[PDB]
């Protein structure tokens, strides 16, 4: 259509106004004194959330240039959520600060590309300093504190994550689901976790989390791909009124041959799900047999010769609950037979003892680790559905932050890590003066998380930032208690992955955004 | 779409204005001197009701932020209705009071998260005090009093509930349905009650109660799930014009295929219903056989060898009336054969005797308990349909109240319980001053039910509140007579569950709502 | 006409919005790094100014309730201008801070009347602490520093005002007017220089200068107007016998008398020059008497009783030297008793004390400066008229501040005095908790000028305020150099009267505004 084309400072101030609207909506949520944002839903009741990426995703503006700025900055929060599941508000605050100071530098007349290069150099150096400053979670051993900080000073959630990880291992899968009582319940049940996703995005249910879930789903297993529709049409037709959603696990379902005609078939009564089988060959066949034994089902194979037309409901397996995500699909609880599960575990352990190859040994040890850990389920207790959603979001943030902490380490919370690495980069220089100004923009913007936390506390951000900068190491400011101290000792820990990801994504988007001279959008 | 984003006090006052509109509409109904609200209905005549959740559900506002506040507070009334089926108005009044005082505290500058934590701590302590204050409701007079109070001081409804529970047992099922006559009739007929719900929400009939009902539904029983459409197509085609809505009870029913093509089949002339069979295995087969004997039908099974096609209209059973709800499905009256039902009761009882296992004995005695109790049907007598709906609402409320009363006990009515619990929590303190202010907000809001009752009486809520606070124990104010006295002696009893639920849901939603700094909604 | 009525939080929010509009327009000028505000004028070019009172005067809002708030807070700047002539921006900033904190307190449910009482108590204690903290400003160096600070760090203005005050003295009068040149000029005239020229051009003794120069002349002071030579004829004959020149001050000399005086002027019998008396009714007689006292003469009037035919040489006044030009008359070293001059000056001082009008008081002080001391005129030099107006406003501010400094002393500038006073009042308490909160909001508002100055420099107000509070005595933050030091040593001095007046007026107005619960105004 006809285009509105804006240039220079007019385009940049419109972009900054949209950035500021999104970033203020997100930034009111930052920190332990951060407040909740109500997001209206046409679906049902409004969602009350402290989660910055949710707020950012809901933001969309009427002015088209402001809307472009808001969408571009919204990418920062969405990328932080996708990468680490936490620190999305910190990432948005960093992005807004970089954008504001970089646009001020552009107004001062510095070359925006050189400003972007300076920002990128400063952020690379800051990522290196964050890696150097990071204390591994094994040495610190403060998983409960990380979960508490991520769950907004909810010590119960932090202790729940700590118990779940001490029970199912630091790498075992943990799933957050809606409970039924007022209290949070930890349930270490038998389950399986594999890193695969759905073939099509049309299997997404009414919830907007992007992960499909099934109530007591059916289990169908196959290593050899089927040849015609009539061979599996009886299995789908059988599950037709079997109140257990047919979860098909095979190599790679063609959406045109299942999803299209099934969508023409059902209007949404039940969500037939198809997922990819990870691995290949004999490893995939062994995993399929293990999953069938877990769920009580059987695997169809050409060598065996047993056919889907001969398959019945009793032959196939089942799982109490299954959650399928693009990143990783988890089976929460499969009944099967406990004695059969234990016998299969013993057989796989004997296979480990018999095998001597490194690849076979490591894959079989991954198998036994998955079977031993099972699935930890955290039931979220809440009186109402809006409290349920808020608390579940906070528990998801705590789980993501604890996972990131065990993956990469911890640093001082409350923006102190960024303050410290900015102080160590005070001597960083670029190839020219505009690159040096970009470096200084990045270093000043690294203060923005702490200052926004202090503003949300209603305290004086400049005074607290000065006091923290005058300190050293993990010295910082406890916003929950409004006093200074060693942040590690007070338990205010941030995952190094979360801080690094927030800084990197905010830097990339904001550095690109400060280089924009022209904006083209619909009238 | 483009979003209207409001912050701070503007967002909070819009939210409070919407809360106030919904809460005033609901609160005019509170107490004995509460008045009726007319809810316009597009389908037909307006409904006149004194129920609070109905009014709250109908409230929806033009201003989008006020609408956000109204929907969030409406969740309180809907949650209370779902939990105890009574106390929705009290819950709304509590939620509005907490919201108002918490927003005043936020304007005073207290940290809203700490206010929410104080409210939650006060409400937890208040739930403990409600359990301590509760007195077991184990008398027929007490049950009658609870029903009378819950039926807007209708002693006839209270006595009807008391007689129904003294006849079918304090746990036997009781169903409220319209009566042709102008008088309320108690009918203790044989019936079956099982805790299961419909597979799909597409079986909901015209009435908005969320429970489907069938006129003389046909009964079909199965423990083995079907494989193809053609096995049951003669049964569906038969009942098609047999004259009885086909109620299908099977192991694990599903509508994936059934619901879509059946909806494509009928346009709504008659309602085909499918429900899950509770339990599993031999227990489910025994229950299915019992239901088939009750309704005169037979249970198709692979072991039996019978098939749906083989079954004729005479072979299959029927029920005078069936009401299916998500929580619990009841068969009001399954004719069958009285001699058959008797003989089956004697057989099952002998099975209980013969049996020695604790699980077997318990389930067996539960079976005979259901058979003996049957269903107590209360026919609501009204001259007109609007009076029918109003009186049926009040009878439903009385039934839910009496149920909760026998389950969890009774406390002083007229908001006296909350007053007493607030007086006992006067010494409760939090971790900081904002938490203490939140505790005080909760304690002050616990007075709101009594004050609103007094306002509906047209009396002075402050004077009555102070007079009740000056007293102790079950001392309160009889609003029906405008005189003070012992609430228990005067018969003004509230179910402890109802009071606790109202308080908990109001607290959860209102504590979340007072923490909101930003609101995002469509323009 | 029909009225719009608003109550409680809504009315207070609209009032605060209007106050904030006015204060945001004004506070951008506070401090050395403060900027200029352009005020559109329906007539002439727009005015560029760095004065809070002008910006505040121009502010008027469309929203009626916001306009109410703006007008009320505009009273602060107007009153500060009226009393001290400086500090109007500091006063508007203080009023905005008090209003903001007090409205916050009202939103917390505290009684606004008690908040106002606490604010009043804190401000009274603050005025006492300012008086205690003030130091005299009598040296010319401190006066120059005060003028420089009040002129937006224009050392030339401060030094010029210091020189003017040193010349004219304590009783001297200094006025600021436009100058033709690009440079500021100081013109000081001593003794009597009343603005009346020769009644006849031919009286000019010195043609190359176009002025009459009389050496040791007699002075004739007649309160009446004359047109005939008969009545002064004995006086003229006596003067001619004496041989010294004569100067006539009278309501008017014209016709035959003037012509005869001129003819005798050329003929040389008597060196005579006649000029009009100064001023108008009720004042002209006072001027004549002042001149008689200076020159040791007597005024010839019909009210007093004496006639001019009976006037003698002893009746005539005496002066050392006289200069008549077309525009003004100058008398040098009038031969009159000193004690009489001091007595007449004391009577005029008593009239000043009795006077209740600005015009009357300035005219009486001008008369005093004519009798004793001197009168100075500062011609402001600027390249254009907009620059002329801006510089004239700054010079008038500097002059007002220097007069205030001489009257009541100086305190540390840069909002440091208010910071120290608020620190000294931390223990002050009221009758109840609401009064205590009012005291606290007044004390916190006392930090507003320093914070706004720092904000106008682009720095962090909170950090600088904390650093200044951590200091003691006159330690402060020089905004011009962005450095810390002794405000007195770096020459950042604020008149005690200016600071006290700003605090007092802002407190009174703001305290009344926070007490508002309803607003009544015309509908839109
Ligand atoms: N008590 C505390 N004192 C100081 N800083 C704290 C405290 N608790 C948490 N923080 C800091 O607050 C930040 C986390 O704030 P918040 O959880 O609101 O946002 P986020 O994690 O960046 O994003 P989001 O939760 O929206 O994904 C971290 O920098 C953390 O170290
Ligand atoms: N005669 C009475 N005197 C005093 N209080 C009474 C009397 N009758 C009932 N109440 C009180 O009135 C309250 C019940 O009010 P009401 O039945 O109007 O609404 P509700 O139970 O809160 O909600 P709903 O809309 O679900 O019916 C209880 O607290 C009960 O104790
Ligand atoms: N170099 C400086 N460093 C610090 N403070 C300074 C400096 N120069 C001036 N100030 C302070 O600026 C304040 C007044 O400056 P300004 O002329 O902007 O406002 P004002 O006198 O309050 O207003 P107005 O001239 O409109 O009546 C005083 O407190 C003075 O001490
Ligand atoms: K957040
Ligand atoms: K009611
Ligand atoms: K100024
Ligand atoms: Mg977080
Ligand atoms: Mg009720
Ligand atoms: Mg000034």
From Swiss-Prot, chains A, B:
Q: Where is the signal peptide?
A: none
Q: Which reaction does it catalyse?
A: ATP + H2O + a folded polypeptide = ADP + phosphate + an unfolded polypeptide
The answer to whether UniProt assigns keyword Acetylation to this entry is yes
**GO MF, any single term:** ATP-dependent protein folding chaperone
One GO biological-process annotation of the entry reads: chaperone cofactor-dependent protein refolding
Activity modulation notes: During the substrate-folding cycle, the two GroEL rings separate for effective substrate binding and chaperonin activity. Ring separation is triggered by ATP binding to the trans ring of the asymmetric GroEL:GroES complex and avoids formation of functionally impaired symmetric GroEL:GroES2 complexes. Activity of the GroEL-GroES chaperonin complex requires Mg-ATP. UMPylation of the chaperone by SelO/YdiU negatively regulates its activity, and may facilitate survival under stress conditions.
Extract the Pfam families matched here.
Cpn60_TCP1
**N6-acetyllysine modification, residue list:** 116
CDD domains from the UniProt entry = GroEL
Summarize the PTM comment: Phosphorylated reversibly during heat shock.
Provide the Gene Ontology terms for cellular component: cytosol; GroEL-GroES complex; membrane
Using the UniProt record, name the top-level EC class of this enzyme in a single word: isomerase
Which residues carry the post-translational modification N6-succinyllysine, per the record? 33, 50, 116, 276, 320, 389
Q: In which compartments does the protein localize?
A: Cytoplasm
Keywords in alphabetical order: Acetylation, ATP-binding, Chaperone, Cytoplasm, Isomerase, Nucleotide-binding
Q: Which domain of life is it from?
A: Bacteria
**What does the annotation give as the result of altering residue 460 to K?**
Temperature-sensitive lethal mutant. At nonpermissive temperature, the rate of general translation is reduced and a defined group of cytoplasmic proteins are translated but fail to reach native form
Per UniProt, ATP binds at 29-32, 50, 86-90, 414, 478-480, 494
Domain notes from UniProt: Each subunit is composed of an apical domain that binds non-folded proteins and GroES, an intermediate domain and an equatorial domain that binds ATP and is involved in inter-ring interactions. Forms a large central channel that appears to traverse the entire length of the cylinder with no obstruction. The central channel of GroEL functions as two cavities, one in each ring, that are separated from each other by the crystallographically disordered 23-amino-acid C-terminal segments of the seven subunits. The entry and exit of polypeptide seem to be restricted to the apical end of each ring.
What family does the Swiss-Prot or TrEMBL record give for this protein? Belongs to the chaperonin (HSP60) family.
The job of this chain, per UniProt, is described as: Together with its co-chaperonin GroES, plays an essential role in assisting protein folding. The GroEL-GroES system forms a nano-cage that allows encapsulation of the non-native substrate proteins and provides a physical environment optimized to promote and accelerate protein folding, probably by preventing aggregation and by entropically destabilizing folding intermediates. Also plays a role in coupling between replication of the F plasmid and cell division of the cell.
| Entries under HAMAP family matching the protein | CH60 (MF_00600)
Task: Tell me the subunit arrangement.
Answer: Forms a cylinder of 14 subunits composed of two heptameric rings stacked back-to-back. Interacts with the co-chaperonin GroES. Can form asymmetrical complexes, composed of one GroEL and one GroES, and symmetrical complexes, formed between one GroEL and two GroES oligomers. The asymmetrical complex is the functional unit. It was suggested that the symmetric heterooligomer may represent a transient intermediate in the chaperonin protein folding cycle.
Q: Quote the protein name from its UniProt record.
A: Chaperonin GroEL
């Amino acid at each position: 259509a006809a285009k509105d084309v804006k240039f220079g400072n007019d385009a940049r101030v419109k972009m900054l106004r949209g950035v500021n609207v999104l970033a203020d909506a997100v930034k009111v949520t930052l920190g332990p004194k951060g407040r909740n944002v109500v997001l209206d839903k046409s679906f049902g009741a409004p969602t009350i959330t402290k989660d910055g990426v949710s707020v950012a995703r809901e933001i969309e503006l009427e002015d088209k240039f402001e809307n472009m700025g808001a969408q571009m900055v919204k990418e920062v929060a969405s990328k932080a959520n996708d990468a680490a599941g936490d620190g999305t508000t910190t990432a948005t605050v960093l992005a807004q600060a970089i954008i504001t100071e970089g646009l001020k530098a552009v107004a001062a007349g510095m070359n925006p590309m050189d400003l972007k290069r300076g920002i990128d150099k400063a952020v690379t150096a800051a990522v290196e300093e964050l890696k150097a400053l990071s204390v591994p979670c094994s040495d610190s051993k403060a998983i409960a504190q990380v979960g508490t900080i991520s769950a907004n000073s909810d010590e119960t959630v932090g202790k729940l994550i700590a118990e779940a990880m001490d029970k199912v291992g630091k790498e075992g899968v943990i799933t957050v689901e809606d409970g039924t009582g007022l209290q949070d319940e930890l349930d270490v049940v038998e389950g399986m976790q594999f890193d695969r996703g759905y073939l099509s995005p049309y299997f997404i249910n009414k919830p907007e989390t992007g992960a499909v879930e099934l109530e007591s789903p059916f289990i169908l297993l196959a290593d050899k791909k089927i040849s015609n529709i009539r061979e599996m049409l009886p299995v789908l037709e059988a599950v037709a009124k079997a109140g257990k959603p047919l979860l098909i696990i095979a190599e790679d379902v063609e959406g045109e041959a299942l999803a299209t005609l099934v969508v023409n078939t059902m209007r949404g009564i039940v969500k037939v799900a198809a997922v990819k089988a990870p691995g290949f060959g004999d490893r995939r066949k062994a995993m399929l047999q293990d999953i069938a034994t877990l769920t009580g089902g059987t695997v169809i194979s050409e060598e065996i010769g047993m056919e889907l037309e001969k398959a019945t409901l009793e032959d196939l397996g089942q799982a109490k609950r299954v959650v399928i995500n693009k990143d990783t699909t988890t089976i929460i609880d499969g009944v099967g037979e406990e004695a059969a599960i234990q016998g299969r575990v013993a057989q796989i352990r004997q296979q480990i003892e018999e095998a001597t190859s490194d690849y076979d040994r490591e894959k079989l040890q991954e198998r036994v680790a998955k079977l031993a850990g099972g699935v930890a389920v955290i039931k979220v207790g809440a009186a109402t559905e809006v409290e349920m959603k808020e608390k579940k979001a906070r528990v998801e943030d705590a789980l993501h932050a604890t996972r990131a902490a065990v993956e990469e380490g911890v640093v001082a919370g409350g923006g102190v890590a960024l303050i410290r690495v900015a102080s160590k980069l005070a001597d960083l220089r670029g190839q020219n003066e505009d690159q040096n100004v970009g470096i200084k923009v990045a270093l000043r913007a690294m203060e923005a998380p702490l200052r926004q936390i202090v503003l949300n506390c209603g305290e004086e951000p400049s005074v607290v930032a000065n006091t923290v900068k005058g300190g050293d190491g993990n010295y910082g400011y406890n916003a929950a208690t409004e006093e200074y101290g060693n942040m590690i000792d007070m338990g205010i820990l941030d995952p190094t992955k979360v801080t690094r990801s927030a800084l990197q994504y905010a830097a990339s988007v904001a550095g690109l955004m400060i280089t924009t001279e022209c904006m083209v959008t619909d009238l």
